[PDB]
């Protein structure tokens, strides 16, 4: 396969559904490279657990933790890391209210080169145990010879775009990593970077981030087909923000509009949203505790009951993962019969204005609260018009894309409800025999 898109290992599925999955120990293994230094971008960290995931021989190599925590949370993280002398920390600035450092990324510097990992898991045991999570693995990027002058740039501009993302932090520890990236050849990269950084962007910067970045890429590097109006949009996520009092406020006016873009020319496109039902969570491998990682508060939900008619159940027979709750986030554009897709995105971004950006100032400014990162698979970047959808995620012509959940998505039944994490469920017990009492 040319895509290098993986799922994390799930404890409790049959071995056939973990063959070709990756655990964090696999990613950090010496087989992937001889580790010199690493940066771990994330939201939540268990530092004791994280160090144990590195190979023993690599556990004293420098690690930088890039986080967004403030005040007591920030103190707690420093306390976790203090026992480890080789760990430095970078507090990503969050100057807009209610922003989060949500990006999940590893920069792995080897003796042999550099690798970039953009994924969806927090660095805690439970996120890698029984959840559906996504991983993109860069190629091993070789160093550019000292004295040689070449861009090391890819047809997708990934090297410049990654550096731009890191420059947005304005952080001394990340300039080090920028200089490391400058020294390596990333020309083999066949994915496009889609990042979110906090700020208010107008003019030339509008297209740099969030859903305008996606729109810009789809305009420039995808083609519109006949009956494009019949190609649905699919969004799949583990958290929902406040989207407004009806669909015209954000969901179908700027989010959907960015996502239905194809080609340079100038809606009844179906929109499927996939988000675990209460029954999905109750009968999951983890039981109700899985809902601790599906943050949708009752306060927000009751303001937007209109949204839930878009919701479809989590189902992933194709990867044996129907009972492994999703913490991966994906967005894609399938054909009307779901046999092809025009593109696929894996990202940290949930269904949230904070993550994707919201237009301000009479449509001239895109305001983003958070750090997010994902990678976009476009057929043009692989010499293709479209991707065939892989029949079974773990089965076997290598140019079909491994969609990790079932298509078509199944609408909620009349008695289903979206998982809402801060109300009780005491009607029926979960797979461990427990109720949920927030």
Ligand X SMILES: O=C(O)c1ccc([N+](=O)[O-])cc1C(=O)O
Q: Rounded to 5 degrees, what are φ and ψ at 50?
A: -60, -45
Q: Which residues pair with 371 in a beta bridge?
A: 101
Q: Which is nearer to ligand X, 142 or 292 (CB)?
A: 292
According to the binding rule CB under 6 A, does residue 250 interact with ligand X?
A: no
Q: Which is nearer to ligand X, 138 or 293 (CB)?
A: 293
Q: Binder to ligand X among 38, 197, 238, 280 (CB under 6 A)? A: 238
Q: Rounded to 5 degrees, what are φ and ψ at 27?
A: -60, -40
- Tell me which residues in 31-60 interact with ligand X (CB under 6 A): 43
Query: In angstroms, what is the minimal distance from the CB of 240 to ligand X?
Result: 9
CA atoms within 13 A on the CB side of 263: 9
Q: Binder to ligand X among 293, 322, 347, 386 (CB under 6 A)? A: 293
Q: Which is nearer to ligand X, 238 or 318 (CB)?
A: 238
Q: Binder to ligand X among 156, 239, 319, 347 (CB under 6 A)? A: 239
| Nearest partner of 118 among 108, 126, 128, judged by Cα | 108
Strand-by-strand arrangement of the 35-41 sheet: 5-7, 134-137, 114-119, 105-110, 35-41, 63-67, 87-91
Secondary structure of residue 219 in the 3-state scheme: helix
Q: Which is nearer to ligand X, 9 or 327 (CB)?
A: 327
Supply the residues annotated as catalytic. 102, 327
According to the binding rule CB under 6 A, does residue 284 interact with ligand X?
A: no
Residue 167: Cβ within 10 Å count: 13
Assigned token pair, 179: 């200089």
Angle between helices 172-182 and 158-167 (to 10 degrees): 170
Assigned token pair, 23: 């655990």
Q: Which is nearer to ligand X, 166 or 351 (CB)?
A: 351
Q: Exposed (0-12), middle (13-18) or buried (19+): which is 253, by Cβ within 10 Å?
A: middle
Spell out, one character per residue from 110 to 149, where the chain touches ligand X: x when CB under 6 A holds, - when not. ------------x---------------------------
CA atoms within 13 A on the CB side of 261: 21
- Token look-up 């990682």 returns 293
How long, in residues, is the chain? 438
Q: Which is nearer to ligand X, 122 or 335 (CB)?
A: 122
- Tell me which residues in 158-217 interact with ligand X (CB under 6 A): none
Assigned token pair, 255: 């989010």
Assigned token pair, 181: 């990236």
According to the binding rule CB under 6 A, does residue 350 interact with ligand X?
A: yes
Query: In angstroms, what is the minimal distance from the CB of 95 to ligand X?
Result: 17
Spell out, one character per residue from 295 to 334, where the chain touches ligand X: x when CB under 6 A holds, - when not. x-------------------------------x-------
What are the binding residues?
104, 329
Query: In angstroms, what is the minimal distance from the CB of 292 to ligand X?
Result: 10
Helical ranges in 272-387 per DSSP H: 278-282, 298-301, 353-356
Interface residues toward ligand X, by CB under 6 A = 43, 100, 102, 122, 238-239, 293, 295, 327, 350
């Amino acid at each position: 396969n040319p895509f290098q898109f993986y799922l994390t290992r799930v404890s409790g599925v049959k071995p056939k559904y973990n063959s070709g999955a990756l655990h964090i120990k696999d990613i950090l293994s010496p087989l992937f490279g001889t580790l010199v230094s690493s940066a771990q971008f994330n939201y939540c960290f268990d530092v004791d657990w994280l160090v144990k995931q590195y190979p023993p021989e690599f556990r004293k190599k420098p690690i930088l933790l890039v986080h967004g925590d403030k005040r007591e949370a920030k103190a707690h993280l420093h306390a976790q890391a203090k026992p480890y002398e080789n760990i430095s920390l970078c507090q990503a600035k969050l100057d807009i209210a209610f922003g989060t450092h949500h990006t999940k990324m590893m920069l792995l510097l080897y003796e042999e080169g550099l690798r970039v990992v953009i994924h969806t898991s927090n660095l805690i045991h439970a996120d890698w145990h029984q959840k559906t999570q996504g991983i993109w693995l860069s190629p091993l990027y070789p160093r550019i010879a000292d004295g040689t002058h070449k861009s090391g740039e890819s047809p997708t501009h990934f090297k410049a775009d990654l550096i731009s993302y890191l420059m947005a932090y304005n952080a001394p520890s990340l300039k080090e990593w920028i200089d490391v990236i400058h020294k390596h050849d990333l020309s083999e990269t066949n994915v496009y970077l889609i990042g979110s950084t906090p700020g208010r962007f107008q003019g030339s910067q509008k297209d740099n981030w969030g859903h305008f970045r996606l729109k810009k890429l789809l305009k420039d590097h995808a083609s519109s087909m006949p009956n494009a109006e019949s190609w649905p949009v699919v969004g799949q996520f583990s958290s929902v923000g406040s989207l407004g009092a009806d669909e015209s406020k954000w969901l179908c006016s700027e989010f959907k509009e960015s996502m239905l873009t194809l080609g340079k020319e100038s809606s009844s496109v179906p929109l499927y949203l996939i988000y675990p039902s209460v029954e999905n969570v109750r009968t999951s491998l983890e039981g109700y505790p899985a809902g601790g990682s599906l943050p949708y508060s009752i306060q927000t939900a009751e303001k937007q009951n209109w949204l839930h008619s878009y919701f479809h159940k989590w189902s992933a027979e194709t990867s044996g993962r129907s009972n492994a709750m999703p913490h991966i986030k994906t967005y894609m554009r399938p054909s009307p019969d779901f046999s092809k897709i025009a593109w696929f995105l894996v990202t940290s971004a949930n269904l949230s204005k904070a993550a994707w950006g919201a237009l301000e100032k009479n449509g001239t400014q895109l305001m983003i609260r958070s750090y997010e990162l994902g990678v976009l698979f476009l057929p043009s970047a692989f010499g293709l018009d479209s991707f065939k959808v892989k029949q079974k995620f773990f089965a076997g012509p290598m140019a079909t894309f491994p969609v990790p959940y079932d298509l078509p998505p199944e609408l909620y039944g009349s008695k289903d409800r979206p998982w809402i994490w801060n109300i009780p469920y005491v009607k029926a017990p979960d797979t461990h025999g427990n109720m949920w009492v927030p």
